Write an enzyme that holds these catalytic residues in place. Structure first.
Site, mmCIF file in Angstrom:
data_model
loop_
_atom_site.group_PDB
_atom_site.id
_atom_site.type_symbol
_atom_site.label_atom_id
_atom_site.label_comp_id
_atom_site.label_asym_id
_atom_site.label_seq_id
_atom_site.Cartn_x
_atom_site.Cartn_y
_atom_site.Cartn_z
ATOM 1 N N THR B 160 20.304 33.881 35.372
ATOM 2 C CA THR B 160 20.428 33.220 34.051
ATOM 3 C C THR B 160 20.348 31.682 34.184
ATOM 4 O O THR B 160 21.019 31.118 35.041
ATOM 5 C CB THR B 160 21.771 33.616 33.397
ATOM 6 O OG1 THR B 160 21.756 35.020 33.117
ATOM 7 C CG2 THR B 160 22.040 32.821 32.103
ATOM 8 N N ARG B 188 24.043 43.146 22.100
ATOM 9 C CA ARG B 188 25.054 42.364 22.799
ATOM 10 C C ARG B 188 24.714 40.858 22.766
ATOM 11 O O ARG B 188 23.561 40.458 22.954
ATOM 12 C CB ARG B 188 25.248 42.879 24.235
ATOM 13 C CG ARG B 188 26.415 42.226 25.011
ATOM 14 C CD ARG B 188 25.961 40.943 25.714
ATOM 15 N NE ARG B 188 26.887 40.481 26.747
ATOM 16 C CZ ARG B 188 26.530 39.726 27.784
ATOM 17 N NH1 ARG B 188 25.270 39.335 27.917
ATOM 18 N NH2 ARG B 188 27.432 39.354 28.690
ATOM 19 N N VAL B 189 25.723 40.041 22.469
ATOM 20 C CA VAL B 189 25.633 38.586 22.603
ATOM 21 C C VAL B 189 26.561 38.141 23.727
ATOM 22 O O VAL B 189 27.721 38.563 23.785
ATOM 23 C CB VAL B 189 26.042 37.872 21.298
ATOM 24 C CG1 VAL B 189 25.875 36.363 21.437
ATOM 25 C CG2 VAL B 189 25.234 38.419 20.112
ATOM 26 N N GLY B 190 26.049 37.300 24.623
ATOM 27 C CA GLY B 190 26.865 36.714 25.678
ATOM 28 C C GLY B 190 27.241 35.280 25.360
ATOM 29 O O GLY B 190 27.331 34.889 24.185
ATOM 30 N N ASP B 191 27.462 34.494 26.409
ATOM 31 C CA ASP B 191 27.959 33.134 26.264
ATOM 32 C C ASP B 191 26.849 32.125 25.934
ATOM 33 O O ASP B 191 27.077 31.145 25.210
ATOM 34 C CB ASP B 191 28.656 32.709 27.553
ATOM 35 C CG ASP B 191 27.699 32.628 28.730
ATOM 36 O OD1 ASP B 191 27.197 33.681 29.178
ATOM 37 O OD2 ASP B 191 27.448 31.511 29.216
ATOM 38 N N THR B 211 26.770 29.652 33.864
ATOM 39 C CA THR B 211 26.208 30.919 34.343
ATOM 40 C C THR B 211 27.313 31.824 34.924
ATOM 41 O O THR B 211 28.309 31.328 35.402
ATOM 42 C CB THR B 211 25.099 30.681 35.374
ATOM 43 O OG1 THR B 211 24.629 31.942 35.873
ATOM 44 C CG2 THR B 211 25.598 29.800 36.527
ATOM 45 N N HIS B 213 29.723 35.717 34.512
ATOM 46 C CA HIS B 213 30.171 36.764 33.586
ATOM 47 C C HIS B 213 30.272 36.190 32.164
ATOM 48 O O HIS B 213 31.115 35.346 31.898
ATOM 49 C CB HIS B 213 31.504 37.403 34.042
ATOM 50 C CG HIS B 213 31.668 38.838 33.630
ATOM 51 N ND1 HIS B 213 32.839 39.335 33.101
ATOM 52 C CD2 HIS B 213 30.798 39.878 33.655
ATOM 53 C CE1 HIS B 213 32.688 40.620 32.826
ATOM 54 N NE2 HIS B 213 31.458 40.973 33.152
ATOM 55 N N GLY B 214 29.399 36.650 31.266
ATOM 56 C CA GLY B 214 29.281 36.065 29.916
ATOM 57 C C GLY B 214 30.452 36.244 28.964
ATOM 58 O O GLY B 214 30.795 35.318 28.230
#
Ligand code: NA
Ligand code: NA
Lengths: 300, 300
Positions: B160, B188-191, B211, B213-214
């Protein structure tokens, strides 16, 4: 153990017309009474905030679930988030369609997935798999909001909602839910589903729920910014006034928040014209819309 | 006036394979050269981070654009965001498919809508409306990502990407972009599209991109956290130390980050085992993947 508290809020925006002011007053009270109830009976901070925001979601007068404002297509598109301060567990959804209570599904995200945030198509798919009933678009749409839109193409308070709690075991939480902005583009996501902006909860500091123009709130991270000031040695009223202080001056954005500290101090402050708000603690209810109109009644 | 610097990162995660080092190196080398290539002509920071990220989206070695991981359903859904440190302006897209450059979509949110965040079908709608090419989906899919999805369907380094920069006018900006995490739930939405999480940029402090774990980067608002320490006077290194270790102690998350301050000071730091990164400053180009093992060569 601690004396429980629940603070709830409506829209952080313009003046409320004489007309709707009785319904607004009634809805905040029903909201906080549901919350305190879970707390009176031993329940969790999260159940108390999930509770209060569900009442507001179902109430057509509030800009969440039923009575959410229309997007550009004349369609209801909702977002919401929940968070538990113990280990910071969190749940959110954006631009969700055809369901009565996004906050409950956000709570589903928090305990029934490895993730913290689902959007649109996938959040719909996760609702189904979980058994959330699909209700037609028109169960959410109101003639008040139907007008609002058609008259926006060619001073308001919509009714974004939120709740913060402290429970008997010293755990904090927040929930926020919104139908967005009137005439927002398709898929516009504001601050309500975004941890740190729409709201934040941490056992070691306190919990915040915000309202206002999402875009500013997002730019300044209003919720985490409030709590950064609390850790800095500021009081709940001091932090609010400062965090709200930056948003007006750095990004020209107004609105309001509510906070509970880990130690039971609570406040509701706004730089917009008005914010509906209620607070329930120690067998009394605190309520207000305009500055200094605050009333207190004893609660049953 | 200031001396310009750009920093780039891939993913701070698992051990890189040996048959993959030079290829990530050439990727990091490209993206950092392209960004500094832009600053050296008196380009803005927002310009530079965008071009640097584009180079990594276009590169199939990395998890953003061409080379994104596949969700639970065999498809590509991408997240991107970007922020101007001067007026706190920002743009972001989440869960987009079948476009080439999600970061380019994130800037069009910034530059050409009164909103900051767009999602899913509403992001694809807006893209088709700004003449962004609607490309075939399988062209973003590589052979490898089909293989990882089956392995999981029957820990690692999923690169990422992001960039920060200070321009020759003192502006800072971040950009970040991703496909997220293999076998993810649809929607899904991450950070990475979230402000204060996957990045933050502020001319009064500096800029950060992240970068790892989101969900973990979100829960702890990592990027804006990093900046809070630099607000208290801690060097950029101690600040990256404090924020990464906190995400570690509190939520058990491993990650990494690049950061540049308003003075033009900078570092790449991580708590995972590896994190490829590169930076351009004073005509010199720095590259690394592991700690202790850094290389510094001329960028003519
Ligand atoms: Na409602
Ligand atoms: Na790529």
């Amino acid at each position: 153990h601690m004396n429980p508290i629940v603070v709830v809020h409506g829209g952080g925006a313009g003046p409320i017309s004489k007309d709707r002011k009785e319904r607004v007053h009634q809805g905040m009270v029903r909201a906080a009474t549901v919350g305190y109830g879970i707390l009176r009976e031993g329940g969790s901070a999260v159940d108390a905030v999930e509770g209060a925001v569900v009442a507001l979601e179902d109430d057509p007068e509030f800009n969440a679930g039923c009575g959410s404002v229309l997007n550009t297509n004349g369609e209801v598109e909702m977002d919401a988030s929940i968070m538990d301060g113990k280990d910071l567990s969190a749940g959110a959804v954006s631009a969700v369609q055809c369901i009565a209570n996004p906050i409950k599904l956000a709570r589903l995200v928090m305990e029934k997935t490895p993730h913290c945030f689902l959007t649109d198509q996938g959040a719909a798919q996760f609702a189904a798999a979980m058994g959330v009933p699909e209700i037609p678009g028109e169960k959410l749409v109101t003639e008040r909001n139907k007008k609002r839109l058609e008259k926006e193409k060619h001073q308001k308070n919509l009714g974004t909602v939120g709740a913060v709690a402290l429970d008997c075991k010293g755990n904090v939480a927040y929930a926020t839910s919104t139908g967005g902005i009137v005439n927002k583009m398709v898929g516009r996501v504001g601050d309500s589903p975004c941890l740190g902006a729409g709201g934040y909860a941490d056992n070691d500091i306190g919990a915040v729920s915000t309202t206002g123009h999402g875009e500013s709130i997002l730019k300044v991270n209003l919720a985490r910014l409030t709590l950064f000031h609390i850790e800095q040695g500021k009081t709940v009223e001091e932090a609010a006034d400062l965090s709200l202080g930056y948003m007006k001056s750095r990004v020209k954005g107004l609105g309001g928040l509510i906070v509970v500290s880990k130690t039971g101090d609570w406040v509701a402050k706004w730089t917009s014209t008005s914010m509906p708000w209620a607070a329930a603690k120690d067998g009394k209810l605190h309520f207000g819309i305009d500055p200094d109109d605050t009333t207190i009644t004893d609660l049953p």
